[PDB]
Structure 1
Amino acid sequence: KNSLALSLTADQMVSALLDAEPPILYSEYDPTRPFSEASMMGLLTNLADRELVHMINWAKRVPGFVDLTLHDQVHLLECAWLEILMIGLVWRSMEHPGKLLFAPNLLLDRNQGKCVEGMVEIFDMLLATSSRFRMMNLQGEEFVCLKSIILLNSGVYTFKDHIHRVLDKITDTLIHLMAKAGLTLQQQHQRLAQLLLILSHIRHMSNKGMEHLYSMKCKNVVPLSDLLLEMLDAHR
């Protein structure tokens, strides 16, 4: 059973991924800047729930993902969802130094982070990632390659060849983008490595964020949706 994904050109892969992009969603329109754990996480849980539905339908459009069994699809999304939410957050925060653009109408500064126990540490990590992407002049085409790598890679060792072939195709596509941008051969492999090492950082943030979400669950602070609870429970 040969997969269509492996037959795409680099340009077709990029086009597919750009076309699959979810929209940027809004938070609620109440002006009140959240400063409490309850108001903050109320907004974030609502936003994330809505983003998850778009994420699931985005994943179906990532070339190669459809070729997996439903069980494998479930596992990869369970593993990767918070990483994917986070890399999206860091991407849309790039042009807002020192701030996190959770939504166009929900821009937080780290001051609001300090008013939630456990949050500033992750806040700073996310800010550092955004700044790093900004200084690297990360392009949209590169971003969607990275997000797809997170989807396919983060659960692949907790299960095979098909996923690795698709990952290889995305590596090819990244290098293609860098060559198209005029990078020298040395610059291409150096940039590839820089980007993939940031993914270790994104994994780290997701790990710590997930622990905080579990603390959230146990404290019964904010009402959590059943979808979120099931996605979170996959990491217990």
Structure 2
Amino acid sequence: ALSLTADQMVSALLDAEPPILYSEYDPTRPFSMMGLLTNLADRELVHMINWAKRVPGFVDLTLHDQVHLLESAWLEILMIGLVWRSMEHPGKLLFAPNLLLDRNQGKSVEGMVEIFDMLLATSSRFRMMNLQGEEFVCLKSIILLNSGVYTFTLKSLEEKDHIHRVLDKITDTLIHLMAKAGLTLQQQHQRLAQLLLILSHIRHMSNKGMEHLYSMKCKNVVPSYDLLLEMLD
């Protein structure tokens, strides 16, 4: 992983991309929104595990540290994927190609419209920046490696060092993408910062979302350490 070139980092990430899934509802029947969203998210998580194992550097970590990173990052990763898919659909969130919802549809569940609105504003920001696919895959990998790295022994010190080295490679890769597209050195640093600052907002959204999910007080909601460990092991 640490010997990959920038172009090789980009190809590895593009090749690891998970598929876009569909909502499971009978389209011949009349139009539970949270049920549909939960079932979709549960299926996405399985693909998320397979993706994570393909991000360079990730399978070099201990299984316990892989679980901790996914546990910290899984809702941020679902959210950045949602916002990316929704970028060319102003005013709507493309949960799936058969489940395109507006903010009015969000008002059906108490507390959801506020989350819908933050996600729509994020998609708006990505549109304004003209975010590219190759930049998006870099940012999603940065979420995976960064979100849990501050919340974890000699082995732990070695693991954190490695994670920071991999993050440095992804930064190099972003900058290389921006240099390729012709931006100046000033423009490169400015855009790097613009991109990474949106990650702060994605964290914020994930925390507001997790508050919603925990408030459900339900064993079939939020993947456990043990479920994540079973799927990763």
Q: When the two structures are superposed, what TM-score results if normalisation uses the length of structure 1?
A: 0.89
Identity of aligned residues (%): 98
Q: How does 1:140-179 map to 2 (within 5 A)?
A: 140-159=133-152, 160-179=160-179
Report if aligned partners of 1:41, 1:222 keep a CA contact under 8 Å in 2.
no
Q: Distance in 2 between matches of 1:199 and 1:223?
A: 22
Report if aligned partners of 1:78, 1:231 keep a CA contact under 8 Å in 2.
no
Q: Deviation at 1:220?
A: 8.4
Q: Distance in 1 between matches of 2:214 and 2:231?
A: 11
C-alpha spacing 1:11/1:228, structure 2 compared with 1 (3 Å):
closer
C-alpha spacing 1:111/1:31, structure 2 compared with 1 (3 Å):
farther
Q: Distance in 2 between matches of 1:225 and 1:9?
A: 34
C-alpha spacing 1:190/1:231, structure 2 compared with 1 (3 Å):
farther
Q: Deviation at 1:114?
A: 1.1
Q: Which runs of 4+ in 1 moved over 4 A?
A: 32-35, 218-233
Report if aligned partners of 2:55, 2:141 keep a CA contact under 8 Å in 1.
yes
Q: How many residues align?
A: 226
Q: Distance in 1 between matches of 2:232 and 2:111?
A: 18
In terms of mean alpha carbon deviation, does 96-105 or 217-226 score higher? 217-226
Q: Deviation at 1:229?
A: 13
Tell me the alpha carbon deviations over residues 99-150 of structure 1, each in whole angstroms, 9 at most, x when there is no partner. 0000000000000111110001111000000010011010000000000000
Q: Secondary structure at the match of 1:218?
A: coil
C-alpha spacing 1:232/1:134, structure 2 compared with 1 (3 Å):
farther
Q: Deviation at 1:33?
A: 9.8
Q: Deviation at 1:185?
A: 0.7
C-alpha spacing 1:56/1:224, structure 2 compared with 1 (3 Å):
closer
Tell me the alpha carbon deviations over residues 75-108 of structure 1, each in whole angstroms, 9 at most, x when there is no partner. 0000000000000000000010000000000000
Q: Deviation at 1:31?
A: 3.4
CA RMSD, 1 decimal: 3.1
Report if aligned partners of 1:49, 1:227 keep a CA contact under 8 Å in 2.
no
C-alpha spacing 1:189/1:40, structure 2 compared with 1 (3 Å):
same
Report if aligned partners of 1:14, 1:145 keep a CA contact under 8 Å in 2.
yes
Tell me the alpha carbon deviations over residues 141-181 of structure 1, each in whole angstroms, 9 at most, x when there is no partner. 00000000000000000011000000000000000000111
Q: Distance in 2 between matches of 1:162 and 1:127?
A: 35
Q: Distance in 2 between matches of 1:57 and 1:221?
A: 21
Task: Extract unaligned runs of 5+ from structure 2.
Answer: 153-159
In terms of mean alpha carbon deviation, does 120-129 or 210-219 score higher? 210-219
Q: How does 1:15-54 map to 2 (within 5 A)?
A: 15-31=11-27, 39-54=32-47
Q: How does 1:69-80 map to 2 (within 5 A)?
A: 69-80=62-73
Q: Distance in 2 between matches of 1:141 and 1:24?
A: 17
C-alpha spacing 1:195/1:34, structure 2 compared with 1 (3 Å):
farther
C-alpha spacing 1:115/1:224, structure 2 compared with 1 (3 Å):
farther
In terms of mean alpha carbon deviation, does 208-217 or 11-20 score higher? 208-217
